[PDB]
Amino acid sequence: MKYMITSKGDEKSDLLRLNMIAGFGEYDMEYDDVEPEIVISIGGDGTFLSAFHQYEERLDEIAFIGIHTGHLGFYADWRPAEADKLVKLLAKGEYQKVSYPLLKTTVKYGIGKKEATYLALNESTVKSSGGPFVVDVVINDIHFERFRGDGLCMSTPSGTTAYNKSLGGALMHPSIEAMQLTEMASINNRVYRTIGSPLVFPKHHVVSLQPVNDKDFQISVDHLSILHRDVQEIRYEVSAKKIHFARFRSFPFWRRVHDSFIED
Amino acid sequence: MKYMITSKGDEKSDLLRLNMIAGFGEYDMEYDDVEPEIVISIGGDGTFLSAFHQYEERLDEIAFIGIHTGHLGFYADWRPAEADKLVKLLAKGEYQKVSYPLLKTTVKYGIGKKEATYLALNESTVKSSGGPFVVDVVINDIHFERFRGDGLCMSTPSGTTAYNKSLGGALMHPSIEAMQLTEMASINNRVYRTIGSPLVFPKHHVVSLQPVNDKDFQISVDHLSILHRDVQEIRYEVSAKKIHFARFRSFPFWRRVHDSFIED
Amino acid sequence: MKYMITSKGDEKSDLLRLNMIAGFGEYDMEYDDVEPEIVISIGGDGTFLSAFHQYEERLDEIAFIGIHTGHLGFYADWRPAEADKLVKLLAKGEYQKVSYPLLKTTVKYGIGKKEATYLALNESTVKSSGGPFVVDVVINDIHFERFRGDGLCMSTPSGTTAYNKSLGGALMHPSIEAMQLTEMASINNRVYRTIGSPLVFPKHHVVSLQPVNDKDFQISVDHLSILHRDVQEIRYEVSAKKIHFARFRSFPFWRRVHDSFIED
Amino acid sequence: MKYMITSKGDEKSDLLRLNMIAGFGEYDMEYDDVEPEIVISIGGDGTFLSAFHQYEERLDEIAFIGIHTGHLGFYADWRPAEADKLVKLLAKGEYQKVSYPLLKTTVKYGIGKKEATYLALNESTVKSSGGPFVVDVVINDIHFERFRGDGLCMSTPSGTTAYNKSLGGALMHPSIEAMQLTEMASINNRVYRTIGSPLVFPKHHVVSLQPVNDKDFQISVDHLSILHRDVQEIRYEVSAKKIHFARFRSFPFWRRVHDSFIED
Ligand SMILES: [N]C1=N[C]=NC2=C1N=[C]N2[C]1O[C]([C]N([C][C][C][N]C(=O)[C][C]N=N=[N])[C]C#CC2=NC3=C([N])N=[C]N=C3N2[C]2O[C]([C][O])[C]([O])[C]2[O])[C]([O])[C]1[O]
Ligand SMILES: [N]C1=N[C]=NC2=C1N=[C]N2[C]1O[C]([C]N([C][C][C][N]C(=O)[C][C]N=N=[N])[C]C#CC2=NC3=C([N])N=[C]N=C3N2[C]2O[C]([C][O])[C]([O])[C]2[O])[C]([O])[C]1[O]
Ligand SMILES: [N]C1=N[C]=NC2=C1N=[C]N2[C]1O[C]([C]N([C][C][C][N]C(=O)[C][C]N=N=[N])[C]C#CC2=NC3=C([N])N=[C]N=C3N2[C]2O[C]([C][O])[C]([O])[C]2[O])[C]([O])[C]1[O]
Ligand SMILES: [N]C1=N[C]=NC2=C1N=[C]N2[C]1O[C]([C]N([C][C][C][N]C(=O)[C][C]N=N=[N])[C]C#CC2=NC3=C([N])N=[C]N=C3N2[C]2O[C]([C][O])[C]([O])[C]2[O])[C]([O])[C]1[O]
């Protein structure tokens, strides 16, 4: 099948990539980075997020695999010593696919109310450029709170172990089709009030962030920034699209959580 | 239809109950507290939890309604001045029902490994009698962590605004069939380690709490305690049973959250 | 005595300032904004922080008073209706002064290791421009942790009810000569580790923040930014200087806390 | 000098104690557990807290030393392999003493308003027997908040790395004469409100806990419980007494914190 391999870029990852390419050359496997059906990421979770966005337009036709040349990653869940066994089992095929939910981010900007859309595998954040900013939080067209603070983070299930976790959010199993909103240093006194707790939204719920005064701020989607100015709204909802993983053995999410945060 | 009315017990609630009973006497409505199809709770959320457990054996044949004689409740979402309109709309019928997920708690105890089961509308907690206690946390038969601290709380979705919220847990919309585990003052140092973050589990996942040394502690289910000694395991899973609410108008969960924590 | 009055700038504050100036004209009080002995701030805590930095070079010769034209402030603890009584009691004199500790911030920058120093009444923060940044935390010349996250906040006692509070820090009575360091969304996994808890340092302890890779970031002191590039170190210590308040009646810190966060 | 040695009780600690006793027999050192001037604790922090309370009536005449037969402790900061060097340097003398602040707990109980007093090295806690309880919090005779939740914890500086830390409290250097109050799962909604943040009190401030309805609950002082019923008040204040440590080398508090929570 058509495949491609992304590399973190250091000597170790580039070398494993070349050895896997040589291994794939011994089967009916063609290297194609334009229309790959299999995308292998060799590096960390940052390398994997890069591969995801590199092919975010062909998500339904791609199964991702991550190899971690350093420590264990949440998306890179293969050890480099198993690369040959990966090439072998990947060559034959007949593997099962596993799908994780994604986050759709819509940004309304400009005088013409143009709308740009993005997909996030970890999270999308809206953050003040400097100091605190003010944003109205609207849930299914009802005004919920006026947030004053550093920013807000909307995470996917698999993203809950990332930025979301550092903000006090809950860890959610990726079989739950949902999104989680966490606060970044909210102001709470007699006059200003936020819910404080993380909020977990099901499918079809729409969370709208509407900045009040200043209209220029930082919007992130995973490891990058959404470059649009004069923003009037950031809408969040569980995407109808999913990322597909090629799985070859049982590595449960909670064991992955245990291995990455408890002890390995 | 057969109905019954529980009362908080003060003058205000007893009086509204008697007036509603008189109102129901003007329709084809029979008072029956043995096999009611409608259970009306007049009081707070504590009164509502009492009504739930009072009829936890006929949950699939009952639609609950809560009236709050004091402040707004999360389960008591009717104002006393609307009691007549409630009797009227309840008398005719044709209302829609809304179902919230529940939590199944199984307690393995004794030499014979007997198993008692309970249903929780808010949460079930395992807490040390005095000082900290030690419990092994097993998720789908894999050991996840050894918890050392004051206790653990497993909450339903509608329970996430209760004990769960005070422990730092996330607020989950009740359409999500899940349960959330939060820690109570865990010890974390070089030797002892817990995940710290709240954990959200989907259906069919089983969380097993297995106390290590001391085998006598406090188990709660909502507002009461499970009285069984020589405990060997407390198993948590999303129940296959649901609580059914009779709804007569739109009162969304997030507006209920806003009204109870932000401002009303 | 020589005095001056700063104004928030809206109609209400400018008007009270002009009326107080007219009131002071009836006593041996001279308006002098170059060498004032009394500085009156009419507005919010933001107006008061402006007045503090406007005269941060003559702190030992000035007693500050704050009037809040809106809600109660932590530094503006006079109501506008008491402005006449303030002018009267201020005119006579014989009032007691109250001193709060301050925070000294030293920034080492450039090839020549130049050092600029600043005083903070609330806090000084070091924050990443975009995404997370890495800083080594050195306490009294011993390496304590390598912080990876959004930033760090070092607060004075009176500042603990401000940014520090939103970051989970403790509220400290201003009679305690100390500073408190809080984290902003630290990364914590198997590889990366911070203390997590807020840290409270006594006098003469020096906390040094030494950025690891990127050397360009945002340094704040109260409501403004310290504009120096090529930073090599940010040193924190309790200042030997103090801010002096003119007090005319008992308004204890904890009652001020109660009035601003509990209920007023 | 007169000395005594407490032991955790396992084979390793009892054996080191007997070897140190034999070592002390070679100097002008007399074993006396009635009036010791030096108290050596061999075990963990639990063993050290036992030794502290065992001699809490002669604190001003005793210098404590802790040896940790297992992992490093915050009070047991000597390794067992250095026991001979400890006996040797302790035999000569001329060591410096280091003093940490303590917490005075006064319990008013009974019809006669009797008052029992206790000293805490780590903390004193007031906790509900079952479910949540209600206590009024009075600071210097002014009512600050009505706490509804699981309990409250008042910690010494050296205690801030213990129960206080697990409750979100700040870590305070023991040179700061203060006490810190942290909440245990407080209820916060539209009707019920607490400060939420930890509170740090200087010397001479008195925090009074006055239970509202139920008058029977659990009071702890370090590892034990204060057995008095019909309680009307629990008063907290920084004690005028201090615990004295015999120090033989520099082991700074922050390095001790780093070694116990970051990495060792
Ligand atoms: N504050 C905070 N906190 C927390 N978190 C966070 C923050 N911010 C941000 N964040 C994240 O991040 C991501 C991105 N990136 C890249 C870039 C950045 N970075 C760098 O720099 C490095 C160094 N550091 N420093 N300084 C990529 C990634 C990733 C991931 N993912 C995940 C999941 N899912 N789970 C779990 N884990 C995880 N991870 C991790 O994380 C870290 C960082 O990464 C590392 O380990 C990795 O493995 C965004 O997305 C957000 O989330
Ligand atoms: N710590 C903590 N925190 C938090 N929380 C908690 C705690 N513990 C417990 N808890 C809860 O609680 C419940 C039970 N109870 C009764 C009994 C007890 N109580 C009493 O006493 C009173 C007084 N107080 N004091 N002191 C009933 C109920 C309920 C409910 N539910 C809900 C939901 N769902 N959401 C929201 N909210 C809510 N609620 C609320 O809550 C509170 C208390 O209630 C009140 O307001 C009410 O409305 C158990 O279940 C747990 O959850
Ligand atoms: N995230 C976060 N959180 C928290 N916090 C914070 C933050 N960031 C920052 N911060 C603060 O701030 C300050 C400054 N500023 C001005 C500027 C900014 N601002 C604006 O925009 C407005 C709107 N908002 N929004 N969006 C001034 C001031 C002040 C103060 N001070 C105090 C004390 N001491 N205590 C208590 N409270 C207080 N305060 C308050 O606070 C708020 C804000 O202000 C208000 O209410 C006032 O009264 C810096 O310093 C930091 O601290
Ligand atoms: N929740 C929570 N959390 C936290 N914490 C706490 C709690 N509760 C309580 N606590 C503590 O504690 C103590 C007492 N104890 C004994 C008894 C109990 N115990 C047992 O069991 C064992 C097993 N476990 N489990 N389960 C003794 C001691 C101590 C101490 N001290 C200190 C300082 N200062 N710093 C730092 N660290 C420390 N420590 C530690 O801690 C842990 C526990 O110990 C161990 O590692 C030790 O080394 C009371 O006092 C309170 O604090």
Side-chain angles (χ1 to χ4, degrees), chain B residues 132-134 148 150 185 187 189 192, chain D residues 45 74-75 122-123 158 161-163 166:
Chain B
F133 77 153
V134 189
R148 303 173 175 82
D150 286 356
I187 311 179
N189 52 39
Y192 310 144
Chain D
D45 288 327
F74 265 80
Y75 302 118
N122 266 4
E123 76 286 300
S158 62
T161 46
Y163 209 163
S166 294

PDB file of all heavy atoms in Angstrom, chain B residues 132-134 148 150 185 187 189 192, chain D residues 45 74-75 122-123 158 161-163 166, ligand 4:
ATOM      1  N   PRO B 132      -5.477   8.747  56.665  1.00  0.00           N
ATOM      2  CA  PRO B 132      -5.465   8.235  55.293  1.00  0.00           C
ATOM      3  C   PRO B 132      -5.554   6.718  55.247  1.00  0.00           C
ATOM      4  O   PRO B 132      -5.187   6.012  56.188  1.00  0.00           O
ATOM      5  CB  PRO B 132      -4.108   8.719  54.763  1.00  0.00           C
ATOM      6  CG  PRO B 132      -3.232   8.706  55.975  1.00  0.00           C
ATOM      7  CD  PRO B 132      -4.121   9.068  57.148  1.00  0.00           C
ATOM      8  N   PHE B 133      -6.066   6.218  54.124  1.00  0.00           N
ATOM      9  CA  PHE B 133      -6.113   4.786  53.869  1.00  0.00           C
ATOM     10  C   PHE B 133      -5.489   4.499  52.509  1.00  0.00           C
ATOM     11  O   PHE B 133      -5.178   5.409  51.737  1.00  0.00           O
ATOM     12  CB  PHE B 133      -7.549   4.227  53.969  1.00  0.00           C
ATOM     13  CG  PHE B 133      -8.442   4.522  52.777  1.00  0.00           C
ATOM     14  CD1 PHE B 133      -9.491   3.665  52.481  1.00  0.00           C
ATOM     15  CD2 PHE B 133      -8.262   5.641  51.976  1.00  0.00           C
ATOM     16  CE1 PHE B 133     -10.328   3.906  51.409  1.00  0.00           C
ATOM     17  CE2 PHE B 133      -9.096   5.886  50.900  1.00  0.00           C
ATOM     18  CZ  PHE B 133     -10.131   5.017  50.618  1.00  0.00           C
ATOM     19  N   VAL B 134      -5.299   3.214  52.226  1.00  0.00           N
ATOM     20  CA  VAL B 134      -4.628   2.760  51.016  1.00  0.00           C
ATOM     21  C   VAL B 134      -5.583   1.864  50.244  1.00  0.00           C
ATOM     22  O   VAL B 134      -6.154   0.924  50.810  1.00  0.00           O
ATOM     23  CB  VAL B 134      -3.325   2.006  51.339  1.00  0.00           C
ATOM     24  CG1 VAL B 134      -2.538   1.741  50.066  1.00  0.00           C
ATOM     25  CG2 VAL B 134      -2.494   2.784  52.348  1.00  0.00           C
ATOM     26  N   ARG B 148      -3.168   6.568  48.101  1.00  0.00           N
ATOM     27  CA  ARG B 148      -3.004   6.852  49.520  1.00  0.00           C
ATOM     28  C   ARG B 148      -3.541   8.252  49.781  1.00  0.00           C
ATOM     29  O   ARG B 148      -3.030   9.227  49.219  1.00  0.00           O
ATOM     30  CB  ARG B 148      -1.539   6.755  49.943  1.00  0.00           C
ATOM     31  CG  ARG B 148      -0.889   5.416  49.662  1.00  0.00           C
ATOM     32  CD  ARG B 148       0.600   5.485  49.949  1.00  0.00           C
ATOM     33  NE  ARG B 148       1.250   4.188  49.804  1.00  0.00           N
ATOM     34  CZ  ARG B 148       1.638   3.671  48.648  1.00  0.00           C
ATOM     35  NH1 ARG B 148       1.433   4.304  47.504  1.00  0.00           N
ATOM     36  NH2 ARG B 148       2.251   2.491  48.638  1.00  0.00           N
ATOM     37  N   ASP B 150      -7.340  10.495  51.532  1.00  0.00           N
ATOM     38  CA  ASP B 150      -8.568  10.509  52.319  1.00  0.00           C
ATOM     39  C   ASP B 150      -9.674   9.664  51.700  1.00  0.00           C
ATOM     40  O   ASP B 150     -10.474   9.074  52.432  1.00  0.00           O
ATOM     41  CB  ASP B 150      -9.057  11.950  52.506  1.00  0.00           C
ATOM     42  CG  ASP B 150      -8.222  12.721  53.504  1.00  0.00           C
ATOM     43  OD1 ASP B 150      -7.309  12.110  54.104  1.00  0.00           O
ATOM     44  OD2 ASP B 150      -8.473  13.929  53.696  1.00  0.00           O
ATOM     45  N   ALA B 185      -7.597  14.435  48.599  1.00  0.00           N
ATOM     46  CA  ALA B 185      -6.331  14.646  49.306  1.00  0.00           C
ATOM     47  C   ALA B 185      -5.423  13.417  49.206  1.00  0.00           C
ATOM     48  O   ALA B 185      -5.227  12.672  50.163  1.00  0.00           O
ATOM     49  CB  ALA B 185      -6.582  15.007  50.772  1.00  0.00           C
ATOM     50  N   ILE B 187      -1.795  11.592  48.770  1.00  0.00           N
ATOM     51  CA  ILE B 187      -0.395  11.818  49.105  1.00  0.00           C
ATOM     52  C   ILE B 187       0.436  11.623  47.847  1.00  0.00           C
ATOM     53  O   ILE B 187       0.313  10.601  47.161  1.00  0.00           O
ATOM     54  CB  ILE B 187       0.062  10.871  50.225  1.00  0.00           C
ATOM     55  CG1 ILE B 187      -0.934  10.894  51.385  1.00  0.00           C
ATOM     56  CG2 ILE B 187       1.455  11.253  50.704  1.00  0.00           C
ATOM     57  CD1 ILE B 187      -0.565   9.964  52.520  1.00  0.00           C
ATOM     58  N   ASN B 189       4.500  12.091  46.742  1.00  0.00           N
ATOM     59  CA  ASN B 189       5.894  12.427  46.998  1.00  0.00           C
ATOM     60  C   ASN B 189       6.746  11.518  46.118  1.00  0.00           C
ATOM     61  O   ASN B 189       6.270  10.949  45.130  1.00  0.00           O
ATOM     62  CB  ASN B 189       6.209  12.319  48.499  1.00  0.00           C
ATOM     63  CG  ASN B 189       5.796  10.983  49.095  1.00  0.00           C
ATOM     64  OD1 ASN B 189       5.940   9.932  48.467  1.00  0.00           O
ATOM     65  ND2 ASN B 189       5.276  11.020  50.318  1.00  0.00           N
ATOM     66  N   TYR B 192       5.191   7.830  46.862  1.00  0.00           N
ATOM     67  CA  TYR B 192       3.769   7.613  46.632  1.00  0.00           C
ATOM     68  C   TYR B 192       3.289   8.492  45.483  1.00  0.00           C
ATOM     69  O   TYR B 192       3.654   9.669  45.398  1.00  0.00           O
ATOM     70  CB  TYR B 192       2.965   7.913  47.901  1.00  0.00           C
ATOM     71  CG  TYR B 192       3.493   7.223  49.144  1.00  0.00           C
ATOM     72  CD1 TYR B 192       3.445   7.850  50.382  1.00  0.00           C
ATOM     73  CD2 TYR B 192       4.044   5.949  49.078  1.00  0.00           C
ATOM     74  CE1 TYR B 192       3.925   7.229  51.520  1.00  0.00           C
ATOM     75  CE2 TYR B 192       4.527   5.318  50.213  1.00  0.00           C
ATOM     76  CZ  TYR B 192       4.466   5.963  51.430  1.00  0.00           C
ATOM     77  OH  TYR B 192       4.945   5.342  52.561  1.00  0.00           O
TER      78      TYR B 192
ATOM     79  N   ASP D  45       8.939   9.888  59.392  1.00  0.00           N
ATOM     80  CA  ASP D  45       8.356  11.091  59.975  1.00  0.00           C
ATOM     81  C   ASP D  45       7.290  10.747  61.006  1.00  0.00           C
ATOM     82  O   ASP D  45       7.062  11.522  61.943  1.00  0.00           O
ATOM     83  CB  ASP D  45       7.774  11.982  58.878  1.00  0.00           C
ATOM     84  CG  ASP D  45       8.846  12.656  58.045  1.00  0.00           C
ATOM     85  OD1 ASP D  45       9.922  12.973  58.596  1.00  0.00           O
ATOM     86  OD2 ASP D  45       8.612  12.869  56.838  1.00  0.00           O
ATOM     87  N   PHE D  74      11.304  14.521  56.092  1.00  0.00           N
ATOM     88  CA  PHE D  74      11.479  15.954  56.297  1.00  0.00           C
ATOM     89  C   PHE D  74      12.024  16.267  57.678  1.00  0.00           C
ATOM     90  O   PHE D  74      12.726  17.271  57.850  1.00  0.00           O
ATOM     91  CB  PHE D  74      10.159  16.694  56.064  1.00  0.00           C
ATOM     92  CG  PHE D  74      10.022  17.220  54.682  1.00  0.00           C
ATOM     93  CD1 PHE D  74       9.630  16.386  53.660  1.00  0.00           C
ATOM     94  CD2 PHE D  74      10.325  18.537  54.392  1.00  0.00           C
ATOM     95  CE1 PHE D  74       9.516  16.859  52.380  1.00  0.00           C
ATOM     96  CE2 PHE D  74      10.226  19.012  53.110  1.00  0.00           C
ATOM     97  CZ  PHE D  74       9.819  18.171  52.100  1.00  0.00           C
ATOM     98  N   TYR D  75      11.713  15.430  58.665  1.00  0.00           N
ATOM     99  CA  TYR D  75      12.284  15.562  59.997  1.00  0.00           C
ATOM    100  C   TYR D  75      13.439  14.605  60.232  1.00  0.00           C
ATOM    101  O   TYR D  75      14.383  14.951  60.944  1.00  0.00           O
ATOM    102  CB  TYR D  75      11.200  15.336  61.057  1.00  0.00           C
ATOM    103  CG  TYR D  75      10.044  16.299  60.915  1.00  0.00           C
ATOM    104  CD1 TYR D  75       8.760  15.852  60.649  1.00  0.00           C
ATOM    105  CD2 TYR D  75      10.248  17.669  61.026  1.00  0.00           C
ATOM    106  CE1 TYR D  75       7.708  16.742  60.508  1.00  0.00           C
ATOM    107  CE2 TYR D  75       9.199  18.562  60.884  1.00  0.00           C
ATOM    108  CZ  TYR D  75       7.936  18.095  60.623  1.00  0.00           C
ATOM    109  OH  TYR D  75       6.892  18.987  60.485  1.00  0.00           O
ATOM    110  N   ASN D 122       3.080  19.258  62.734  1.00  0.00           N
ATOM    111  CA  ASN D 122       2.621  19.270  61.352  1.00  0.00           C
ATOM    112  C   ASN D 122       1.368  20.123  61.206  1.00  0.00           C
ATOM    113  O   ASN D 122       1.403  21.187  60.579  1.00  0.00           O
ATOM    114  CB  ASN D 122       2.337  17.850  60.866  1.00  0.00           C
ATOM    115  CG  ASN D 122       3.518  17.229  60.156  1.00  0.00           C
ATOM    116  OD1 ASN D 122       4.593  17.825  60.070  1.00  0.00           O
ATOM    117  ND2 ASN D 122       3.323  16.024  59.639  1.00  0.00           N
ATOM    118  N   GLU D 123       0.257  19.662  61.772  1.00  0.00           N
ATOM    119  CA  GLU D 123      -1.008  20.366  61.608  1.00  0.00           C
ATOM    120  C   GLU D 123      -2.002  19.881  62.650  1.00  0.00           C
ATOM    121  O   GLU D 123      -1.796  18.870  63.324  1.00  0.00           O
ATOM    122  CB  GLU D 123      -1.590  20.161  60.205  1.00  0.00           C
ATOM    123  CG  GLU D 123      -2.219  18.789  59.999  1.00  0.00           C
ATOM    124  CD  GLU D 123      -1.179  17.690  59.850  1.00  0.00           C
ATOM    125  OE1 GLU D 123      -0.364  17.783  58.911  1.00  0.00           O
ATOM    126  OE2 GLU D 123      -1.168  16.751  60.674  1.00  0.00           O
ATOM    127  N   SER D 158       6.702  23.834  58.778  1.00  0.00           N
ATOM    128  CA  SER D 158       7.252  22.534  58.406  1.00  0.00           C
ATOM    129  C   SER D 158       6.155  21.537  58.064  1.00  0.00           C
ATOM    130  O   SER D 158       6.409  20.571  57.338  1.00  0.00           O
ATOM    131  CB  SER D 158       8.150  21.984  59.518  1.00  0.00           C
ATOM    132  OG  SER D 158       7.439  21.775  60.724  1.00  0.00           O
ATOM    133  N   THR D 161       4.469  20.802  53.916  1.00  0.00           N
ATOM    134  CA  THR D 161       4.794  19.759  52.952  1.00  0.00           C
ATOM    135  C   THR D 161       4.023  18.469  53.198  1.00  0.00           C
ATOM    136  O   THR D 161       4.253  17.485  52.489  1.00  0.00           O
ATOM    137  CB  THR D 161       6.298  19.475  52.974  1.00  0.00           C
ATOM    138  OG1 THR D 161       6.743  19.354  54.329  1.00  0.00           O
ATOM    139  CG2 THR D 161       7.057  20.606  52.298  1.00  0.00           C
ATOM    140  N   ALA D 162       3.112  18.452  54.161  1.00  0.00           N
ATOM    141  CA  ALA D 162       2.400  17.241  54.559  1.00  0.00           C
ATOM    142  C   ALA D 162       0.935  17.377  54.141  1.00  0.00           C
ATOM    143  O   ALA D 162       0.683  17.671  52.967  1.00  0.00           O
ATOM    144  CB  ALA D 162       2.624  16.991  56.044  1.00  0.00           C
ATOM    145  N   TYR D 163      -0.032  17.173  55.044  1.00  0.00           N
ATOM    146  CA  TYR D 163      -1.452  17.254  54.704  1.00  0.00           C
ATOM    147  C   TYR D 163      -1.776  18.536  53.947  1.00  0.00           C
ATOM    148  O   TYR D 163      -2.518  18.514  52.959  1.00  0.00           O
ATOM    149  CB  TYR D 163      -2.277  17.165  55.991  1.00  0.00           C
ATOM    150  CG  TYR D 163      -3.659  16.553  55.863  1.00  0.00           C
ATOM    151  CD1 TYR D 163      -4.335  16.100  56.990  1.00  0.00           C
ATOM    152  CD2 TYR D 163      -4.292  16.434  54.631  1.00  0.00           C
ATOM    153  CE1 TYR D 163      -5.599  15.543  56.899  1.00  0.00           C
ATOM    154  CE2 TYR D 163      -5.562  15.875  54.528  1.00  0.00           C
ATOM    155  CZ  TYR D 163      -6.209  15.434  55.668  1.00  0.00           C
ATOM    156  OH  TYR D 163      -7.466  14.876  55.585  1.00  0.00           O
ATOM    157  N   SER D 166      -1.243  18.328  50.185  1.00  0.00           N
ATOM    158  CA  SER D 166      -2.246  17.549  49.468  1.00  0.00           C
ATOM    159  C   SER D 166      -3.565  18.294  49.325  1.00  0.00           C
ATOM    160  O   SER D 166      -4.378  17.932  48.469  1.00  0.00           O
ATOM    161  CB  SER D 166      -2.483  16.215  50.176  1.00  0.00           C
ATOM    162  OG  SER D 166      -1.321  15.401  50.125  1.00  0.00           O
TER     163      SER D 166
HETATM  164  N1  LIG E   4      -4.679  12.691  53.018  1.00  0.00           N
HETATM  165  C1  LIG E   4      -3.463  13.058  53.433  1.00  0.00           C
HETATM  166  N2  LIG E   4      -2.614  13.603  52.534  1.00  0.00           N
HETATM  167  C2  LIG E   4      -1.397  13.974  52.941  1.00  0.00           C
HETATM  168  N3  LIG E   4      -0.858  13.884  54.158  1.00  0.00           N
HETATM  169  C3  LIG E   4      -1.718  13.344  55.027  1.00  0.00           C
HETATM  170  C4  LIG E   4      -3.007  12.912  54.757  1.00  0.00           C
HETATM  171  N4  LIG E   4      -3.604  12.409  55.904  1.00  0.00           N
HETATM  172  C5  LIG E   4      -2.681  12.549  56.823  1.00  0.00           C
HETATM  173  N5  LIG E   4      -1.516  13.110  56.365  1.00  0.00           N
HETATM  174  C6  LIG E   4      -0.321  13.430  57.138  1.00  0.00           C
HETATM  175  O1  LIG E   4       0.089  12.274  57.845  1.00  0.00           O
HETATM  176  C7  LIG E   4       0.659  12.702  59.095  1.00  0.00           C
HETATM  177  C8  LIG E   4       0.717  11.537  60.063  1.00  0.00           C
HETATM  178  N6  LIG E   4       1.621  10.463  59.635  1.00  0.00           N
HETATM  179  C9  LIG E   4       1.232   9.153  60.175  1.00  0.00           C
HETATM  180  C10 LIG E   4      -0.231   8.789  59.981  1.00  0.00           C
HETATM  181  C11 LIG E   4      -0.673   8.695  58.534  1.00  0.00           C
HETATM  182  N7  LIG E   4       0.326   8.049  57.695  1.00  0.00           N
HETATM  183  C12 LIG E   4       0.152   6.845  57.153  1.00  0.00           C
HETATM  184  O2  LIG E   4      -0.861   6.173  57.331  1.00  0.00           O
HETATM  185  C13 LIG E   4       1.287   6.344  56.294  1.00  0.00           C
HETATM  186  C14 LIG E   4       0.799   5.668  55.024  1.00  0.00           C
HETATM  187  N8  LIG E   4       0.093   6.653  54.181  1.00  0.00           N
HETATM  188  N9  LIG E   4      -1.029   6.372  53.710  1.00  0.00           N
HETATM  189  N10 LIG E   4      -2.030   5.923  53.386  1.00  0.00           N
HETATM  190  C15 LIG E   4       3.037  10.714  59.886  1.00  0.00           C
HETATM  191  C16 LIG E   4       3.689  11.615  58.922  1.00  0.00           C
HETATM  192  C17 LIG E   4       4.202  12.413  58.197  1.00  0.00           C
HETATM  193  C18 LIG E   4       4.808  13.427  57.409  1.00  0.00           C
HETATM  194  N11 LIG E   4       5.155  14.616  57.862  1.00  0.00           N
HETATM  195  C19 LIG E   4       5.634  15.282  56.744  1.00  0.00           C
HETATM  196  C20 LIG E   4       6.110  16.594  56.563  1.00  0.00           C
HETATM  197  N12 LIG E   4       6.196  17.498  57.545  1.00  0.00           N
HETATM  198  N13 LIG E   4       6.487  16.957  55.318  1.00  0.00           N
HETATM  199  C21 LIG E   4       6.391  16.062  54.330  1.00  0.00           C
HETATM  200  N14 LIG E   4       5.956  14.801  54.383  1.00  0.00           N
HETATM  201  C22 LIG E   4       5.585  14.471  55.623  1.00  0.00           C
HETATM  202  N15 LIG E   4       5.046  13.272  56.053  1.00  0.00           N
HETATM  203  C23 LIG E   4       4.754  12.121  55.210  1.00  0.00           C
HETATM  204  O3  LIG E   4       3.357  11.983  55.061  1.00  0.00           O
HETATM  205  C24 LIG E   4       3.082  10.626  54.640  1.00  0.00           C
HETATM  206  C25 LIG E   4       1.897  10.090  55.407  1.00  0.00           C
HETATM  207  O4  LIG E   4       2.168  10.015  56.799  1.00  0.00           O
HETATM  208  C26 LIG E   4       4.390   9.840  54.817  1.00  0.00           C
HETATM  209  O5  LIG E   4       5.008   9.632  53.553  1.00  0.00           O
HETATM  210  C27 LIG E   4       5.238  10.763  55.698  1.00  0.00           C
HETATM  211  O6  LIG E   4       6.633  10.612  55.459  1.00  0.00           O
HETATM  212  C28 LIG E   4      -0.217  13.876  59.508  1.00  0.00           C
HETATM  213  O7  LIG E   4       0.480  14.745  60.395  1.00  0.00           O
HETATM  214  C29 LIG E   4      -0.519  14.560  58.167  1.00  0.00           C
HETATM  215  O8  LIG E   4       0.380  15.635  57.913  1.00  0.00           O
END
